[PDB]
Amino acid sequence: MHLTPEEKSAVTALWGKVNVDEVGGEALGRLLVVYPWTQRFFESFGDLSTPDAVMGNPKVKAHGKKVLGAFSDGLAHLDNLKGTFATLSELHCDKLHVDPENFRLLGNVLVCVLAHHFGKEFTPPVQAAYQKVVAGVANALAHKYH
Amino acid sequence: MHLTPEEKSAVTALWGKVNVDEVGGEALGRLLVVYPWTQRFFESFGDLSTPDAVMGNPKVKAHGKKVLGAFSDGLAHLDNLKGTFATLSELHCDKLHVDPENFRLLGNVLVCVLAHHFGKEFTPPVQAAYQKVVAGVANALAHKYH
Amino acid sequence: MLSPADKTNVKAAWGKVGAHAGEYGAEAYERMFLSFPTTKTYFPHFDLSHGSAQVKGQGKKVADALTNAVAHVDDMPNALSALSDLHAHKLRVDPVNFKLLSHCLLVTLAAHLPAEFTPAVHASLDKFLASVSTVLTSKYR
Amino acid sequence: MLSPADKTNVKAAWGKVGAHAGEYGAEAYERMFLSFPTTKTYFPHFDLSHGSAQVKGQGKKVADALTNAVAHVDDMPNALSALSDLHAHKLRVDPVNFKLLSHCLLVTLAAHLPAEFTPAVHASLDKFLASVSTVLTSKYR
Ligand code: HEM
Ligand code: HEM
Ligand code: HEM
Ligand code: HEM
């Protein structure tokens, strides 16, 4: 995707300060709390009955780290997001049956989670660059659906 | 955009039966009727008070003809929609201030008009090819927004 | 909010649909699966080929519930209560997808009711399906 | 539908916002204009640069209306009646845009209230803004 030099730099500098396991556990947990119908994919994960149970469930934290891990690897290949997520796009469609609209919901909770963690350093301009990236990633993941 | 050869032929054979002025006035009229907030742009067009007054408004019918004639010419350039609608994209964003969501609404009303017009000839696979065309056109028109 | 003219329009258009409601419900699901392929992620357990009995039974269940809401249009939350419960707690369909079905139902109705699908009835039908969608997703959270 | 716990959460979070509400409203509009550039088509008459008083004025007006909604949370349709009329028949903002400002509000809240923006309060606030959005577009057709 086309990112200005200023947007690429903003995305990359902030991401160097992120602890990918913690932020991944938070983002996934908040997705399951704020949009509870997303729990239809995680029936085998244990107690998801309340916010505290969601946020403390170790299966939610281990999945979150996995998800953001592969997201993190996509930030190294911003010029070819489609080629980078092709394999995982096909997996999410043919084996997991995950509606791509959930990629968009997660991209917006992730932005909320960065703002909550970094405060006034997550400025308007920097949120703009991350909104383009999460929309680009959601796009790449839904690309092989059929 | 990528349409299979079957989809392109389905799109082109139907459209050879369309009366562009008739369908254009019908599609824009019904846009203004079913989604009344889209009337914000046309306060100089006269009486828009009731469905019959929209549908019979000469200025609505004239604007429809113009909008669908440009659409029609894009159908000849299905491999390069972005390049075809680039200057119109800029005009809708810098001078007309038209929220691109309007394009998507018009594309769905246009699909309902074609089904009403063609009845059983408008089959599920014919609809699928036209949905891809209207979403491609809406994306081309929103391309240069900034 | 459905006005009285909306309610009259919906009761007339659906009255004409009549005994084909079930066949129209199946065709709208098939139109949705081909135009918007991501909706097939909610039906992995179904044979989705044209004319499949599974699609025909889903089309007939949805039509019946539409008929019930037209009959109880002034009291829809109470009449669709069990359906909203099932969608919110068991099926959990993302609420984006309701707009796609609605559009495809509208295209189905257009294609079958030449004389009745006027601009004002089109407007009323679109508003009625948005309200049914709202009621069906009211208990999601 | 807002539960008793949701209402309690919103009053608490909005209470801490307090006298900054106007500043948070302007920041949310600025976040919205940079992240979702199509939303600038509704303010062609404004100076949209960072720090604009026109943007600050709009942020203060929107903040005051949400304060009024929080204060009348069990009677929102009546307290926001005039605002609903105004968006429906003169401004005519397409509905999609209401979800874009609501997300930017949330982002603004998270960035400024790191102790109060818990998962539970994040869920209640999102439900609260969807409800304000629904009330504001209630009279569109
Ligand atoms: C940024 C977007 C996402 C990325 C990059 C991503 C990546 C991954 C990866 C790397 C796996 C592991 C595959 C394996 O070997 O089994 C996976 C599995 C999975 N993902 Fe995605 N994911 C994303 C979003 C989501 C969302 C939003 C959902 C659902 C709401 C989801 C549902 C799943 C499920 C159900 C699995 C299987 C977990 C299991 O084994 O039970 N993913 N994903
Ligand atoms: C397929 C979708 C559309 C196409 C192809 C299209 C095309 C055009 C064209 C060819 C013109 C005249 C260009 C000129 O004067 O240089 C135009 C103008 C205009 N369009 Fe669009 N348009 C579309 C959708 C819309 C929609 C949905 C709206 C608003 C609801 C809109 C609002 C306008 C307005 C207000 C004008 C100016 C008219 C005047 O000055 O009389 N257009 N459009
Ligand atoms: C007008 C909106 C809709 C209505 C009135 C409706 C109604 C119904 C009804 C009556 C049933 C059968 C319940 C039973 O067996 O007790 C059902 C099931 C189901 N619906 Fe909904 N539905 C709507 C929209 C949707 C949408 C948009 C989707 C997915 C994209 C969806 C997916 C399903 C699924 C997956 C089932 C269960 C199928 C099975 O396993 O038999 N529905 N719906
Ligand atoms: C919580 C959601 C919203 C609330 C509470 C709200 C409330 C208000 C209020 C109180 C006013 C000022 C009315 C007056 O002059 O007395 C206003 C004006 C306006 N709003 Fe909304 N609004 C919301 C969302 C939106 C959105 C999403 C948009 C478009 C992207 C929008 C566009 C406008 C515009 C263009 C004006 C008039 C600006 C002017 O002075 O020229 N509003 N709004």
End-to-end C-alpha gap of chain C: 22 Å
Largest sheet of chain A: none
Number of helices of chain A: 7
- Quaternary state reads heterotetramer
- CATH top level of chain A is Mainly Alpha
Bound molecules: protoporphyrin IX containing FE
Strand content of chain C: under 5%
Say what the CATH topology of chain A is: Globin-like
SSE string of chain A, helix = H, strand = E?
Answer: HHHHHHH
CATH architecture of chain A: Orthogonal Bundle
What do we call the CATH homologous superfamily of chain C?
Answer: Globins
- In this structure, how is the largest beta sheet of chain C organized? none
PDB class: oxygen storage/transport
Keywords: globin, oxygen storage-transport complex
Assembly: tetrameric
Entry title: Crystal Structure of deoxy HbalphaYQ, a mutant of HbA
Task: Describe the structure in your own words.
The complex is a heterotetramer, with 2 copies of chain A (146 residues) and 2 copies of chain C (141 residues). With 146 residues, chain A is mostly helical. Chain A has one domain (1-146): Globins (Globin-like, Orthogonal Bundle), CATH 1.10.490.10. Helices cover 68% and strands 0% of the residues of chain A. Chain A is built from 7 helices and no strands. In chain A, helix 1 (5-15) packs across helix 7 and helix 2 (20-34) packs across helix 6 (101-118). Chain A is globular. Chain C is mostly helical and 141 residues long. Chain C has helices spanning 4-17, 21-35, 53-71, 76-79, 81-91, 96-112, 119-136. Chain C is globular, with a radius of gyration of 14 Å. Chain C has a single domain (1-141), classed as Globins (Globin-like, Orthogonal Bundle), CATH 1.10.490.10. Chains C, D: The record marks 8-9, 13-14, 24-25, 29-30, 45-48, 52-53, 55-56, 59-60, 91-92, 106-109, 121-122, 133-134 as: (Microbial infection) Cleavage. Chains C, D: The modification N6-succinyllysine is found at residues 7, 11, 16, 40. Chains C, D: Keywords: Acetylation, Disease variant, Glycation, Glycoprotein, Heme, Hereditary hemolytic anemia, Iron, Metal-binding, Oxygen transport, Phosphoprotein, Transport. Chains C, D: The modification Phosphotyrosine is found at residue 24. Chains C, D: O2 binds at residue 58.
